Amino acid sequence: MQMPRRFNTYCPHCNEHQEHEVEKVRSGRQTGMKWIDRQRERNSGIGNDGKFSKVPGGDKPTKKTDLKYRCGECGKAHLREGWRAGRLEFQE
Amino acid sequence: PSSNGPLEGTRGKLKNKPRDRGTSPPQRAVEEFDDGEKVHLKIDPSVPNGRFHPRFDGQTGTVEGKQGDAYKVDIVDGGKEKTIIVTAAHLRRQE
Amino acid sequence: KPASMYRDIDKPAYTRREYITGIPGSKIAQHKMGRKQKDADDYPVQISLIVEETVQLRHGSLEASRLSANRHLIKELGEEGDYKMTLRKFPHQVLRENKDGMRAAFGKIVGTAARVQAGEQLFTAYCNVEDAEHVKEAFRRAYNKITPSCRIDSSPAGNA
Amino acid sequence: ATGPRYKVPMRRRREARTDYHQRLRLLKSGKPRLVARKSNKHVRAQLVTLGPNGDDTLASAHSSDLAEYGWEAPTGNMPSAYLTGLLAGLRAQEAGVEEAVLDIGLNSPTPGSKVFAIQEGAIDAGLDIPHNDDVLADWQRTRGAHIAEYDEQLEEPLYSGDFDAADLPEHFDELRETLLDGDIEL
Amino acid sequence: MHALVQLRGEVNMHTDIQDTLEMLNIHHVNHCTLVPETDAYRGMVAKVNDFVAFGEPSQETLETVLATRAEPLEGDADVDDEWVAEHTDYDDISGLAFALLSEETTLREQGLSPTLRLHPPRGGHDGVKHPVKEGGQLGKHDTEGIDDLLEAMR
RNA sequence: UUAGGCGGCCACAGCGGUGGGGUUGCCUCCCGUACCCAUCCCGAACACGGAAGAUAAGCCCACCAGCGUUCCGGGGAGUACUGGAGUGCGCGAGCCUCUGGGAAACCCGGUUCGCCGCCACC
RNA sequence: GUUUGACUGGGGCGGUACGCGCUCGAAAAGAUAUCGAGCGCGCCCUAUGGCUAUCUCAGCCGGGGACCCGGCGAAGAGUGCAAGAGCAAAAGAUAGCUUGACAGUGUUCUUCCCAACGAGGAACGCUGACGCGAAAGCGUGGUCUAGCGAACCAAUUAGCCUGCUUGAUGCGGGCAAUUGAUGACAGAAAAGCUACCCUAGGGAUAACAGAGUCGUCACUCGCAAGAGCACAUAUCGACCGAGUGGCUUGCUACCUCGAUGUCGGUUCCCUCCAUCCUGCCCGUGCAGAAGCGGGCAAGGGUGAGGUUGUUCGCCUAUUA
RNA sequence: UGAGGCGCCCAAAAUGAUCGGGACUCAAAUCCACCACCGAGACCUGUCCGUACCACUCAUACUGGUAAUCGAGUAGAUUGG
RNA sequence: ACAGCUGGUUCCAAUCGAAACAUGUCGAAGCAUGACCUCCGCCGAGGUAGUCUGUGAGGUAGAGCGACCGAUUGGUCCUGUCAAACUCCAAACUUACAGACGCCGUUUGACGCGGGGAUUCCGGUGCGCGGGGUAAGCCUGUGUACCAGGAGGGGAACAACCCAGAGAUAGGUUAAGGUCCCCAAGUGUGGAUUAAGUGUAAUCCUCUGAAGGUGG
């Protein structure tokens, strides 16, 4: 489906309607220093490694929208529930 | 049933007799009831909103207050007490 | 296949063509016989074949009886005799057959039948006071090819 | 009409007098309605309330009984409409009515029209009615100015039965002046 | 006022039909109760119609049954004119019988057990598999038929 | 209500038809576009301003039943169906009796060409 | 070293009735099963959402299958997609404007009738901020019922809490929430063979047999079209209809799994009749002889051989 | 010529036939009525037991009272011996 | 060793008395949570298994369709037929609430509430209504009573068909069913039919008897 790059809506930060810009959330890189990262190294050794021997699951036929909404005046973003959309293309 | 949605098997109870077909009179949609009043519950096919679960059609409850314009009606489903949010459009005074 | 299999009314009415496909064509060639251009009121005698028990009659049976009855009326009154007979019932009930044991047993469609309540007129003839006995014979041969017992009732006919 | 299954509209629908969808939305306020009507020659204002066997009018005013206070002018114009609303409004306050919702029935919400004039009048009478100023004709028009200047482009008196030559908005003032006053027998 | 006598046991009888008999103070076979003729009671007897025998008895018959089977609300004190006279609003059984038949009072109202625990029918009854019109003993009876039964069960 | 406004019930009110009604009164048709307002083009409509004309529309009043609808009488029908009961009948599908309820179609004769509430008004 | 699921008229194969929605089944409150009947959903849409203004649709007729004018026309149109339901001065069409498909937090119902259970859903509120409208009011997505996903972990959004004597920096831990999937859909990370097999049990579930059924099979009867050169009925006999048996087969899972040893044959005994011979009859398209058809009748008889394990059947010479 | 009642033909199975048997024919069959009987632990009645409740009581020890509206029971819960 | 699988688990009595179903489950030979049984405590005045009446809900039976819809005849308006997934109509009946009467509760404390303990989640039969199947002592629903866990009387025998719900003991009268003998009671009365031993068989896997025919 189609969707406007910018449009007026409520900004929970300014607490009033203002223009926002919609952006698909880009994945941020991992640091490899989170607790889970250290548990994988502490608990992995000889033989099977329990949960750390499992491999990536499947995929749902369609994913939900994963967007950021940035307020055009205070520069802050807020998240919203997403909805299943086979495709999301912005207009302009 | 073959399915279990809210409108399963409601072909009859949610269908209008042909002559009652069409937008309903506003009078009964604006009616005011007092707490303690006995009201019969019956969905009006022509009115979309303010309905209760079809399974409760035919109940005679007791107005025990309101929420916004809708009314909170107390009924006893079997032996279980329940509170129903319903708009006047689907209610009628008893007796 | 034996009629014992379908003669009783032990199942829901099954007639909706919109939800049933593959329904075999009927074997009944005609429902109105004799001189169908003339009215029934134009006759002094009116005799019907009445069913005595409620039953289902398959189209293959309606055809055999009707045939074996009109045939006689034709042989005794001629290919143009001054008479007219009517088979007033049509086979609306669709019949199945489970032809794998009792698993997914709903049967495939195999035929059609007409439901007849006891006391009803299956056939009705209109003749002249002369051929009144030839029609009584046609019915005698007709009720011999259908399940129930029948009464050959003589409606308009006080010439005895 | 055609058969058993035929659906005949509610009486007031087939007579083309009541817009039920608008009615319902109106009744949802819980407030009395300032029912503004108008005929070719007259204008009528009524404060209607909901009732068991039908609506209930608590107060009202007609352009006819306007003369009853000193009006010799026509009764189908702007000055006429406003004063009628004010008269009905004043009587409204009498019976204890304090607020209303404009019910223009099947008339159009044209800016500066008479049903809106009836409204401004009823509001000046002290009644609390949800409105919008920039939809009300400007003061002067209400007075009757637009018709004065029209008579200005004379050649043949605008009015037949000489009520006056160059007509009068100043009269409107005298009548409004007489209504806003306390005394007056409502 | 109709006399009601249970003639068919509780085994296999519908529960709502059995509860109806109990509301009419009948808990055993051969037990009789006196019920006023009202719309409410009418629905009740019509419901237990197939397990009972009922009808309006003659004043005399009611007098015989009361004499022989009436009991106090409590205790084994025999009920006779003297008892009636000293415990009820009447002078003797007759005064009571009349007031009952005319529905001015009830046994319970006069300190008597609501039930007349009758004896099996001497000479037997007409059967509990057929109504009166078919030669049985079930359902509504004539005052003479009802008296015949009650007297046999005296 | 000698013609009006806002309605409740939402065809007993619909469809169709006949007759009657209006000088400064009422509703209308009607006359007219400087204004407020209006038409994807039209003062047609919407809106505004107005009285030369008119009761032909509409409307209101009185009425007609052919079609549609409501209710009612008589007939169909205590039929069809049915809650309770049965050591009643039938090879059987099924039927009957007693008790308590009880249609629909259709025909014939009536009823129905709205009823009611608030306000205003020779 | 383990896993290789569940359902199932036994199991396997087939299928998914394994998560959802609609009509019917369902017996006029509610609830209600089967490998029950018809059939759908795992999306799509920035408008195909929202409001306002103006407006009325299928279809038919008349006048100049595109367009223009008039008439009839309560809805048969349209409303994204199943089905059922809703809707006409609209919930449909057109035009314009707009982003409420918004943030926070609840009430109630549903999910799960009654009657406890999560996610998910719906109706209805309060608060905040907005859109449109003269205003009442409408907008918590699409008229209603399908379009859905736990914990752990990661990424993401804004502010704040916190990390072992202490301060600074790095890098971590946490409060709230969004997104990523488990369709075996209230969530394990997961293929088969065993006739070399083993244990626990089950007649809770199959094979043979018994029992029930009798569609199938065998046999009979009613009707008698038709032909039999003429001739229904010497004889053959379609259709359709009604039955009997329990010899075939199928169905069911009632009995038996702490066992009732398979088929065929053989040997030996009793029986049934729907009769092949023998006795006695009737008809004949009965000259005779002999055929053919039918009736009574179960005393007796009904044998030997070739292939094949065969039952069956085919074949040979005898035979009443 | 119409209708009704009972019966007859249709009607064949395997160790020994059957309405339980005997056996029954103006019935010991069938249908319509009727009369009198037999027959449960049901119902009525005497006495006793248990249990529940009541009065008195420290008592759950006696004594008295009430039970038409108490008296069957697998799994299981409760309690005295 | 473990098993969700088979077997067994020892004295007496008194009160009450099920569930063989719902939701979830690698779950269907198991559990948990509900329903239901029981025990204890709290509460303190009503309760509602029956019926009647009033105010409502409902589209099954039936019926009908020139009332929709889709089927389904023929003739030169008429004439012949239908519907589990049709309805212009429309029951009996089921059901919400209330009042009345009844019954019940206020020392036997009902209704309601909190907590302890379960058992149970293979069911079956009759009757009514079903859906599948030619059918079945079939499969799968639903309501109810029964068996299970229910004696005693009858039914030849015979879990659920009839009578009947039962402390002990005793007298009496009946119930279902029966009265020629076996075996308690009639070789009962008035009348009629049957000649087949029809029949002497309520119900039923169990008791057959059909279409067709009969100057008996």
Ligand SMILES: CSC[S@](=O)C[C@H](CO)NC(=O)/C=C/c1c(C)[nH]c(=O)[nH]c1=O
């Ligand atoms: C006591 S069990 C006896 S057995 O079942 C006897 C029956 C005779 O019909 N034999 C069989 O069923 C044989 C079945 C066979 C099957 C299914 N498959 C085979 O490969 N061979 C068989 O013999």
Ligand SMILES: [Cl-]
């Ligand atoms: Cl996205």
Ligand SMILES: [Cl-]
């Ligand atoms: Cl609800």
Ligand SMILES: [Cl-]
């Ligand atoms: Cl107006």
Ligand SMILES: [Cl-]
């Ligand atoms: Cl003891």
Ligand SMILES: [Cl-]
């Ligand atoms: Cl009991």
Ligand SMILES: [Cl-]
């Ligand atoms: Cl004999």
Ligand SMILES: [K+]
């Ligand atoms: K075995």
Ligand SMILES: [Mg+2]
């Ligand atoms: Mg339905």
Ligand SMILES: [Mg+2]
């Ligand atoms: Mg006593």
Ligand SMILES: [Mg+2]
């Ligand atoms: Mg008897």
Ligand SMILES: [Mg+2]
């Ligand atoms: Mg005129």
Ligand SMILES: [Mg+2]
């Ligand atoms: Mg029988």
Ligand SMILES: [Mg+2]
């Ligand atoms: Mg291991």
Ligand SMILES: [Mg+2]
């Ligand atoms: Mg399995």
Ligand SMILES: [Mg+2]
């Ligand atoms: Mg239902």
